[PDB]
């Protein structure tokens, strides 16, 4: 039940971050509706395959939220950028948008299954544990693509606000106007920096190797265990 | 589909290669025998007087 | 037990290979996939740092959370080089220009997702009470991984890309051409 609470809480927090960026109740709602739709469907798939609701399937759900919300965001954000880059209306924009990412969403789900499936194949007792996650996360991702191909486009096209060519929320007054201005600015600052780094380089491959060796260092030092001991509110005392 | 892959030979190879290693991995784990189970099963009751 | 141990190397080995093959199909290239796969370490480092820091262990929860972090940063990198590549291919944009326009179109979506998810797992790293051992273990790995993945990727992926596009090209630019 505590994991369930975190799920709900996580969806609330997602709603808040969406708002910070989308700044419109109806828009933020899209990525927000998508999560529970996919999660609920995932339980149905778990039933279909004879899995139970357990600690591992539940954490699979939690971890899945990162993947799910990104699917919705990629879809919703890309449309936005389009309505900003062109002033094309909502229905026409999601079409052109979906036209240009939809291929990628599907391909990505494929490469991702390549990272989560292999773990369904661990051997022994170990294996049954990792398998709970693998199947939960893969199923959720598959459903997420489905939802991104069916629900999200429909939702963008009917619930999104027309953005006018060139508008970026700077016209707004109060926090958003301020936020939107800082980001637009900080963005030019981002590109300015990359533009610099791309004239350099060599040095950054060297920094990259630092990070790799460091990573390797920490890895071999981090002790390995299996599953944590939890305080389950009971215990026994043996007398011999 | 052929027209699709005629222009995407790498995509074509990828599919072939994935199939091959799925099969290579299968070979490492497949049981070996002369025959699968072909005799019908039997149950025996034994008693003594 | 004997029985035997460590299947990890072999299975993530094939995982890497399949990921490479999938990406090669996606990009119709044997070289470009490296520009995505090189992001993998960038999330791991933060995960290891945060776990080393809280005194955690390399356990089930650490591993799955890492795959998730890796998945996401992979996805981010894929959509970045997809955009650059298309720009260079559909439009005639030259290498650097396309990389910069790609990277700039992708900043926001990347940030929206990173923040939504790092906050989303906060309740987990902060957890006390029933099952907080599991909750803490899940959350902190992800949080650290996502932080480093996010900050490190938005600078490094553009690097991976141009460095890979050069090394594995064939005298035909890197202007700028069209169409
Ligand atoms: C944002 C959406 C996605 C997240 C949602 C995930 C929720 C996870 C739920 C896990 C724990 C639920 O556990 C389950 O709950 C229901 C709730 O009554 C129980 O079901 C029981 O209650 C109801 C009546 O009130 C009856 O319909 C049912 O006959 C009875 O068995 C189950 O017997 C129990 O096993
Ligand atoms: C039989 C067992 C094994 C099954 C095979 C494994 C499949 C692995 C595939 C993973 C990636 C597939 O991803 C797919 O790639 C092609 C080719 O670039 C894309 O196709 C799209 O992009 C390319 C290039 O930008 C265009 O030329 C193409 O016209 C367009 O439709 C798809 O939009 C994408 O979804
Ligand atoms: C490119 C996409 C994918 C890239 C792959 C990234 C994944 C990186 C982290 C994977 C986990 C590595 O961590 C490794 O896990 C195995 C078990 O699972 C551990 O294995 C050890 O502990 C377990 C305990 O259950 C024993 O069964 C095992 O025999 C023993 O050697 C290793 O001590 C550890 O080093
Ligand atoms: C002319 C095209 C040559 C393509 C080479 C691809 C070879 C892949 C072989 C993989 C074997 C497992
Ligand atoms: C022009 C129709 C393209 C058909 C493509 C078929 C794709 C098969 C992927 C396995
Ligand atoms: C997995 C190694 C692939 C090597 C690709 C090299 C392409 C030139
Ligand atoms: C798994 C082997 C892939 C090799 C591809 C080489 C392309 C030139
Ligand atoms: C493993 C930490 C135990 C505390 C959980 C209540």
XYZ file of C-alpha atoms and ligand atoms in Angstrom:
617
model
C 0.000 0.000 0.000
C 2.924 2.371 0.623
C 4.153 1.690 -2.935
C 0.647 2.513 -4.188
C 0.802 5.806 -2.292
C 4.085 6.660 -4.012
C 2.465 5.915 -7.386
C -0.370 8.353 -6.692
C 2.044 10.920 -5.261
C 4.316 10.459 -8.285
C 1.406 11.204 -10.644
C 0.574 14.341 -8.637
C 4.167 15.574 -8.874
C 4.170 14.827 -12.612
C 1.054 16.993 -12.904
C 2.838 19.865 -11.148
C 5.960 19.746 -13.350
C 3.821 19.522 -16.493
C 2.002 22.668 -15.347
C 5.245 24.550 -14.669
C 6.031 24.035 -18.366
C 2.671 23.744 -20.127
C 1.018 26.385 -17.948
C -2.442 25.218 -18.969
C -4.675 22.876 -16.970
C -6.021 21.110 -20.086
C -2.556 20.540 -21.613
C -0.872 19.223 -18.436
C -3.823 16.829 -18.158
C -2.751 14.906 -21.281
C 0.542 13.390 -20.052
C -1.253 13.001 -16.719
C -4.162 10.925 -18.071
C -1.757 8.771 -20.086
C 0.050 7.403 -17.019
C -2.917 5.872 -15.174
C -4.317 4.543 -18.468
C -1.072 2.642 -19.188
C -0.531 1.534 -15.595
C -4.075 0.155 -15.295
C -3.709 -1.657 -18.599
C -0.474 -3.118 -17.301
C -2.309 -4.804 -14.444
C -4.616 -6.350 -17.044
C -1.577 -7.702 -18.916
C -0.122 -9.071 -15.659
C -3.407 -10.911 -15.098
C -3.303 -12.197 -18.671
C 0.126 -13.739 -17.964
C -0.705 -15.039 -14.485
C 1.507 -12.680 -12.489
C 0.576 -11.403 -9.027
C 0.677 -7.950 -7.529
C 3.905 -8.078 -5.512
C 6.701 -5.833 -4.313
C 8.550 -6.242 -7.578
C 5.622 -5.742 -9.975
C 4.709 -2.634 -7.942
C 8.190 -1.142 -8.216
C 8.052 -2.040 -11.903
C 5.014 0.260 -12.104
C 6.840 3.049 -10.292
C 9.883 2.801 -12.527
C 7.549 2.538 -15.524
C 6.230 6.052 -14.852
C 9.502 7.531 -16.100
C 9.103 5.736 -19.406
C 5.342 6.393 -19.712
C 5.373 10.087 -18.908
C 8.252 10.612 -21.361
C 6.176 9.066 -24.165
C 3.314 11.489 -23.473
C 5.656 14.446 -23.014
C 7.529 13.769 -26.257
C 4.176 13.667 -28.048
C 2.619 16.715 -26.324
C 5.767 18.851 -26.349
C 6.575 18.203 -30.002
C 3.093 19.374 -31.033
C 3.563 22.525 -28.953
C 6.923 23.364 -30.546
C 5.134 22.884 -33.880
C 2.293 25.283 -33.025
C 5.005 27.702 -31.905
C 7.298 27.168 -34.892
C 4.449 27.649 -37.377
C 1.159 28.852 -35.885
C -0.510 25.802 -37.401
C -3.705 25.010 -35.486
C -3.868 22.107 -32.942
C -5.515 19.428 -35.110
C -3.193 20.108 -38.056
C -0.109 20.348 -35.828
C -0.416 16.998 -33.999
C -0.850 15.347 -37.388
C 2.407 16.763 -38.686
C 3.946 16.139 -35.272
C 2.862 12.502 -35.002
C 3.984 12.159 -38.603
C 7.548 13.004 -37.569
C 8.030 11.190 -34.216
C 5.588 8.270 -34.310
C 8.130 6.237 -36.270
C 10.704 6.943 -33.560
C 8.405 6.121 -30.620
C 7.853 2.651 -32.053
C 11.533 2.090 -32.816
C 12.550 3.266 -29.332
C 10.151 0.866 -27.630
C 11.981 -1.829 -29.599
C 15.515 -0.907 -28.505
C 14.246 -0.494 -24.941
C 12.805 -4.020 -24.890
C 16.371 -5.042 -25.730
C 17.484 -3.607 -22.376
C 14.686 -5.045 -20.173
C 13.917 -8.432 -21.762
C 17.378 -10.000 -21.283
C 16.774 -9.899 -17.535
C 13.700 -12.127 -17.929
C 16.299 -14.807 -18.661
C 18.310 -14.805 -15.445
C 18.586 -18.323 -14.053
C 17.426 -20.028 -10.886
C 15.763 -18.282 -7.966
C 17.377 -14.981 -8.895
C 15.570 -15.172 -12.248
C 12.001 -15.265 -10.956
C 12.686 -11.940 -9.187
C 14.122 -10.055 -12.189
C 11.376 -11.493 -14.400
C 8.668 -9.675 -12.424
C 10.253 -6.346 -13.400
C 11.084 -7.289 -16.967
C 7.532 -8.286 -17.902
C 5.942 -5.394 -16.000
C 8.198 -2.766 -17.558
C 8.084 -4.181 -21.121
C 4.292 -4.550 -21.066
C 3.924 -1.003 -19.759
C 6.211 0.340 -22.508
C 4.254 -1.523 -25.180
C 0.951 -0.172 -23.849
C 2.559 3.292 -23.605
C 3.311 3.240 -27.354
C -0.265 2.123 -28.046
C -1.613 4.960 -25.898
C 0.781 7.427 -27.526
C -0.551 6.309 -30.923
C -4.260 6.360 -30.029
C -5.190 8.487 -27.040
C -2.516 11.196 -26.802
C -2.870 12.460 -30.412
C -6.658 12.580 -30.055
C -6.201 14.468 -26.761
C -3.651 16.949 -28.143
C -5.922 17.715 -31.081
C -8.963 18.567 -28.932
C -7.604 19.817 -25.605
C -4.537 21.803 -26.676
C -4.552 25.614 -26.892
C -3.745 27.264 -30.213
C -0.231 28.712 -29.969
C 0.512 31.602 -32.329
C 3.575 31.464 -34.577
C 6.447 32.892 -32.546
C 4.704 32.884 -29.156
C 6.720 31.395 -26.292
C 4.829 32.673 -23.248
C 6.973 35.757 -22.730
C 3.845 37.858 -23.249
C 2.554 36.399 -19.985
C 2.658 38.419 -16.760
C 3.392 36.969 -13.352
C 5.465 33.866 -12.698
C 5.042 32.078 -16.047
C 5.928 35.157 -18.093
C 9.012 35.303 -15.895
C 9.712 31.563 -16.056
C 9.133 31.415 -19.819
C 11.525 34.311 -20.351
C 14.283 32.777 -18.204
C 14.017 29.458 -20.066
C 14.032 31.013 -23.556
C 17.142 32.861 -22.424
C 18.788 29.923 -20.639
C 18.171 27.973 -23.856
C 20.208 30.323 -26.065
C 22.822 29.960 -23.318
C 22.643 26.174 -23.665
C 23.193 26.221 -27.443
C 25.890 28.887 -27.110
C 27.788 26.472 -24.837
C 27.401 23.392 -27.054
C 28.457 25.491 -30.047
C 31.586 26.207 -28.051
C 32.192 22.587 -27.000
C 31.824 21.479 -30.631
C 34.667 23.811 -31.629
C 36.670 22.142 -28.871
C 36.051 18.441 -28.176
C 39.224 16.348 -27.798
C 39.204 17.569 -24.189
C 35.654 16.276 -23.631
C 36.440 12.769 -24.875
C 39.161 13.002 -22.231
C 36.576 14.054 -19.627
C 34.356 11.205 -20.843
C 37.132 8.695 -20.162
C 37.545 10.157 -16.670
C 33.847 9.473 -16.018
C 34.151 5.931 -17.408
C 37.162 4.982 -15.265
C 35.536 6.665 -12.262
C 32.346 4.709 -12.959
C 34.426 1.543 -13.163
C 36.146 2.501 -9.910
C 32.885 2.945 -8.001
C 31.385 -0.179 -9.521
C 34.032 -2.667 -8.343
C 33.881 -0.997 -4.913
C 30.104 -1.085 -4.452
C 29.359 -4.297 -2.531
C 26.650 -6.496 -4.035
C 23.647 -7.993 -2.244
C 20.267 -9.332 -3.348
C 17.178 -8.024 -1.536
C 17.327 -5.813 1.597
C 16.226 -7.070 5.011
C 13.100 -5.128 5.979
C 11.694 -4.398 9.387
C 8.458 -6.360 9.132
C 7.318 -5.429 12.625
C 7.900 -8.924 14.022
C 10.772 -11.215 14.981
C 11.642 -14.393 16.859
C 13.989 -15.325 19.678
C 15.411 -18.827 19.855
C 16.192 -20.486 23.165
C 18.285 -23.656 23.228
C 8.566 -4.929 -48.207
C 11.257 -6.189 -50.580
C 11.271 -2.632 -51.944
C 11.550 -1.437 -48.346
C 14.629 -3.552 -47.608
C 16.265 -3.109 -51.009
C 16.832 0.481 -49.840
C 17.570 -0.565 -46.235
C 20.108 -3.420 -46.467
C 21.342 -2.743 -42.925
C 17.837 -3.076 -41.498
C 17.704 -6.324 -43.508
C 20.918 -7.632 -41.932
C 19.805 -6.618 -38.432
C 16.735 -8.853 -38.667
C 18.804 -11.775 -39.952
C 21.448 -11.316 -37.236
C 18.944 -11.048 -34.383
C 17.286 -14.269 -35.603
C 20.695 -15.978 -35.723
C 21.808 -15.118 -32.182
C 18.367 -15.994 -30.816
C 19.016 -19.385 -32.392
C 22.613 -19.614 -31.214
C 21.441 -18.947 -27.671
C 18.691 -21.537 -28.143
C 21.232 -24.212 -29.050
C 23.152 -23.683 -25.792
C 20.024 -24.470 -23.759
C 18.111 -27.074 -25.813
C 17.879 -30.609 -24.372
C 19.361 -33.359 -26.570
C 17.921 -36.846 -27.018
C 17.466 -39.617 -29.537
C 13.687 -39.110 -29.519
C 11.148 -36.873 -27.827
C 8.696 -38.771 -25.622
C 6.980 -41.219 -28.012
C 6.011 -44.261 -25.915
C 2.608 -43.949 -24.244
C 2.802 -43.656 -20.430
C 2.134 -46.691 -18.225
C 1.165 -47.178 -14.582
C 1.862 -50.444 -12.729
C 0.115 -51.835 -9.659
C 2.232 -54.370 -7.786
C 0.999 -56.606 -4.987
C 2.161 -59.639 -3.049
C 0.394 -62.558 -1.375
C 24.699 -22.567 -5.452
C 26.750 -24.406 -8.019
C 24.355 -24.126 -9.813
C 26.858 -21.261 -10.356
C 26.864 -17.464 -10.459
C 27.365 -14.287 -12.495
C 25.256 -14.505 -15.660
C 25.254 -10.705 -15.639
C 28.200 -10.134 -18.014
C 26.873 -12.531 -20.670
C 23.268 -11.315 -20.618
C 24.029 -7.573 -20.654
C 26.598 -8.392 -23.334
C 23.811 -9.682 -25.589
C 21.645 -6.790 -24.395
C 24.310 -4.351 -25.644
C 24.575 -6.201 -28.951
C 20.803 -6.265 -29.539
C 20.558 -2.577 -28.604
C 23.316 -1.856 -31.126
C 21.582 -3.889 -33.838
C 18.202 -2.237 -33.171
C 19.745 1.224 -33.382
C 21.577 0.339 -36.610
C 18.251 -0.611 -38.191
C 16.671 2.585 -36.855
C 19.415 4.792 -38.313
C 20.371 2.610 -41.303
C 23.986 2.904 -40.122
C 26.571 0.725 -38.362
C 28.425 3.718 -36.904
C 25.759 6.199 -35.716
C 24.420 3.906 -32.950
C 27.637 4.536 -30.944
C 26.577 8.175 -30.623
C 23.623 6.890 -28.570
C 25.292 3.983 -26.764
C 28.083 6.174 -25.359
C 25.522 7.846 -23.053
C 25.166 4.668 -20.993
C 27.976 5.481 -18.496
C 26.564 8.975 -17.811
C 23.618 7.688 -15.779
C 25.509 4.813 -14.164
C 28.056 7.179 -12.585
C 25.384 9.157 -10.733
C 23.648 5.986 -9.610
C 26.919 4.603 -8.238
C 27.751 7.934 -6.602
C 24.383 8.263 -4.854
C 24.393 4.620 -3.755
C 28.010 4.742 -2.559
C 27.005 7.894 -0.709
C 23.965 6.539 1.150
C 25.804 3.338 1.982
C 23.642 1.249 -0.321
C 24.456 -1.993 -2.098
C 24.468 -3.273 -5.678
C 21.200 -5.176 -5.267
C 18.063 -6.041 -7.271
C 16.611 -2.576 -6.770
C 19.827 -0.840 -7.729
C 20.044 -2.842 -10.967
C 16.456 -2.377 -12.207
C 16.511 1.347 -11.431
C 19.716 1.615 -13.428
C 18.223 -0.084 -16.486
C 15.412 2.476 -16.234
C 17.795 5.401 -16.023
C 19.767 3.922 -18.922
C 16.577 3.399 -20.905
C 15.567 7.035 -20.475
C 18.943 8.573 -21.308
C 19.144 6.256 -24.320
C 15.720 7.494 -25.406
C 16.824 11.116 -24.974
C 19.956 10.530 -27.057
C 18.013 8.647 -29.748
C 15.583 11.535 -30.244
C 18.460 14.032 -30.362
C 20.466 12.259 -33.079
C 17.250 11.340 -34.896
C 16.562 15.087 -35.190
C 20.095 16.075 -36.170
C 20.329 13.239 -38.689
C 16.949 14.089 -40.256
C 17.869 17.782 -40.444
C 21.087 16.809 -42.249
C 19.114 14.407 -44.469
C 15.667 15.889 -45.231
C 16.668 19.518 -45.025
C 20.284 19.975 -46.097
C 21.548 21.377 -42.803
C 25.271 20.859 -42.225
C 26.619 18.821 -39.293
C 27.167 21.438 -36.552
C 24.096 23.516 -37.445
C 21.894 20.400 -37.333
C 23.402 19.158 -34.056
C 22.755 22.547 -32.437
C 19.187 22.849 -33.751
C 18.525 19.248 -32.720
C 19.973 19.736 -29.256
C 18.035 22.959 -28.752
C 14.676 21.516 -29.853
C 15.232 18.638 -27.438
C 16.338 20.506 -24.291
C 12.869 21.257 -22.944
C 11.249 17.819 -23.369
C 14.361 16.307 -21.766
C 14.138 18.682 -18.791
C 10.370 18.196 -18.355
C 10.855 14.428 -18.149
C 13.947 14.534 -15.932
C 12.360 16.855 -13.375
C 8.979 15.096 -13.339
C 10.714 11.775 -12.674
C 13.380 12.906 -10.180
C 10.629 14.592 -8.129
C 8.422 11.567 -8.699
C 10.898 9.266 -6.947
C 11.609 11.755 -4.130
C 8.902 10.156 -1.916
C 10.929 6.958 -2.318
C 14.371 8.185 -1.226
C 12.639 10.068 1.576
C 10.592 7.086 2.701
C 10.517 5.830 6.280
C 8.242 3.048 7.502
C 7.021 -0.240 6.066
C 9.194 -1.357 3.144
C 11.324 1.811 3.146
C 14.429 -0.328 2.695
C 13.137 -1.359 -0.703
C 11.791 2.133 -1.359
C 15.007 3.904 -0.433
C 17.062 1.486 -2.572
C 14.901 2.052 -5.652
C 14.682 5.820 -5.287
C 18.261 6.910 -4.606
C 19.844 5.006 -7.481
C 17.311 6.495 -9.899
C 17.608 10.013 -8.513
C 21.404 10.103 -8.810
C 21.366 8.364 -12.189
C 18.763 10.747 -13.597
C 20.572 13.830 -12.306
C 23.903 12.910 -13.915
C 22.217 11.408 -16.970
C 20.324 14.663 -17.543
C 23.080 17.235 -16.939
C 25.824 15.160 -18.571
C 23.797 13.990 -21.595
C 22.623 17.400 -22.864
C 26.282 18.385 -23.356
C 27.836 15.039 -24.213
C 25.342 13.635 -26.767
C 26.029 16.480 -29.251
C 29.715 15.571 -28.817
C 29.218 11.846 -29.378
C 27.298 12.687 -32.521
C 29.679 15.042 -34.368
C 32.731 13.023 -33.260
C 31.073 9.857 -34.602
C 29.765 11.540 -37.766
C 33.316 12.662 -38.594
C 35.312 9.519 -37.773
C 32.873 7.380 -39.756
C 32.189 9.512 -42.787
C 33.478 9.643 -46.324
C 34.739 12.948 -47.749
C 31.424 14.716 -48.475
C 31.166 17.796 -46.199
C 30.949 18.776 -43.394
C 29.371 21.793 -44.956
C 26.472 22.734 -45.119
C 25.374 21.517 -48.515
C 21.929 21.207 -50.040
C 20.012 19.919 -51.470
C -2.981 5.615 -11.040
C -3.583 4.263 -11.305
C -2.677 3.073 -11.183
C -2.332 2.596 -9.781
C -3.315 1.647 -9.105
C -2.720 0.401 -8.459
C -3.447 -0.195 -7.266
C -2.774 -1.412 -6.612
C -3.627 -2.308 -5.734
C -2.891 -3.374 -4.948
C -3.581 -3.879 -3.692
C -5.063 -4.189 -3.817
O -5.545 -5.355 -3.228
C -6.856 -5.751 -3.539
O -7.726 -4.663 -3.334
C -9.199 -4.974 -3.485
C -9.995 -3.816 -2.945
O -11.177 -4.075 -2.192
C -9.600 -6.290 -2.895
O -10.921 -6.706 -3.393
C -11.816 -6.916 -2.346
O -12.643 -5.682 -2.099
C -13.795 -5.464 -2.939
C -14.847 -4.777 -2.112
O -14.500 -3.577 -1.462
C -14.393 -6.670 -3.641
O -14.698 -6.304 -4.951
C -13.576 -7.908 -3.729
O -14.459 -9.027 -3.875
C -12.661 -8.103 -2.595
O -11.841 -9.259 -2.801
C -8.640 -7.331 -3.148
O -9.012 -8.579 -2.517
C -7.243 -6.963 -2.753
O -6.325 -8.010 -2.981
C 12.400 -11.560 -36.541
C 13.023 -11.319 -35.193
C 13.665 -9.983 -34.965
C 12.871 -8.756 -35.391
C 13.658 -7.592 -35.971
C 14.088 -6.489 -35.006
C 13.620 -5.085 -35.341
C 14.546 -3.939 -34.913
C 14.110 -2.564 -35.372
C 14.323 -1.408 -34.422
C 14.242 -0.045 -35.075
C 13.135 0.154 -36.089
O 12.833 1.481 -36.344
C 12.359 1.861 -37.605
O 13.445 2.117 -38.455
C 13.013 2.689 -39.782
C 14.208 2.987 -40.646
O 15.024 4.111 -40.326
C 12.116 3.871 -39.615
O 11.511 4.257 -40.887
C 11.364 5.630 -40.937
O 12.718 6.261 -40.729
C 13.631 6.102 -41.833
C 14.860 6.945 -41.620
O 14.727 8.170 -40.937
C 12.974 6.399 -43.158
O 13.850 6.118 -44.207
C 11.713 5.634 -43.320
O 11.136 5.879 -44.602
C 10.775 5.968 -42.241
O 9.539 5.270 -42.393
C 11.043 3.645 -38.695
O 10.353 4.894 -38.454
C 11.480 3.051 -37.392
O 10.403 2.674 -36.562
C 23.430 -1.174 -23.176
C 22.204 -1.480 -22.361
C 22.385 -2.290 -21.108
C 23.699 -2.136 -20.355
C 23.873 -2.933 -19.068
C 23.932 -2.140 -17.763
C 23.717 -2.895 -16.457
C 24.747 -2.660 -15.334
C 24.454 -3.292 -13.979
C 24.113 -4.773 -13.953
C 24.373 -5.518 -12.651
C 25.810 -5.896 -12.332
O 26.072 -6.409 -11.066
C 26.365 -7.776 -10.898
O 25.166 -8.459 -10.646
C 25.386 -9.904 -10.295
C 24.057 -10.579 -10.114
O 22.961 -10.046 -10.853
C 26.303 -10.058 -9.125
O 26.641 -11.472 -8.943
C 27.109 -11.806 -7.677
O 25.973 -11.747 -6.687
C 24.936 -12.725 -6.916
C 24.006 -12.785 -5.739
O 22.652 -13.054 -5.993
C 25.475 -14.099 -7.236
O 24.437 -14.902 -7.709
C 26.576 -14.063 -8.233
O 27.038 -15.385 -8.526
C 27.650 -13.175 -7.765
O 28.803 -13.218 -8.616
C 27.526 -9.330 -9.293
O 28.263 -9.299 -8.046
C 27.388 -7.922 -9.806
O 28.626 -7.414 -10.258
C 28.048 -5.546 -48.465
C 27.386 -5.520 -47.127
C 28.185 -6.298 -46.135
C 27.392 -6.400 -44.875
C 28.174 -7.094 -43.815
C 27.293 -7.443 -42.661
C 27.865 -8.659 -42.013
C 27.149 -9.039 -40.760
C 27.514 -10.448 -40.421
C 27.054 -10.809 -39.045
C 27.239 -12.273 -38.806
C 26.732 -12.633 -37.449
C 6.055 0.438 -48.848
C 5.524 -0.509 -47.828
C 6.608 -0.730 -46.838
C 6.483 -2.076 -46.225
C 7.441 -2.122 -45.091
C 7.318 -3.430 -44.404
C 8.078 -3.345 -43.130
C 8.262 -4.715 -42.581
C 9.040 -4.620 -41.316
C 9.360 -5.994 -40.832
C 29.056 -4.361 -32.270
C 30.204 -3.866 -33.080
C 29.689 -3.279 -34.344
C 30.831 -2.720 -35.115
C 30.289 -1.788 -36.136
C 31.403 -1.187 -36.916
C 30.793 -0.443 -38.049
C 31.848 0.147 -38.921
C 26.974 -8.350 -34.675
C 27.884 -7.997 -35.805
C 27.492 -6.730 -36.496
C 28.613 -6.378 -37.423
C 28.250 -5.291 -38.378
C 29.444 -4.919 -39.198
C 29.043 -3.860 -40.171
C 30.139 -3.550 -41.137
C 16.026 -1.756 5.972
C 15.529 -0.542 6.679
C 14.450 -1.014 7.587
C 13.534 0.081 8.020
C 12.204 -0.194 7.399
C 11.097 0.179 8.328
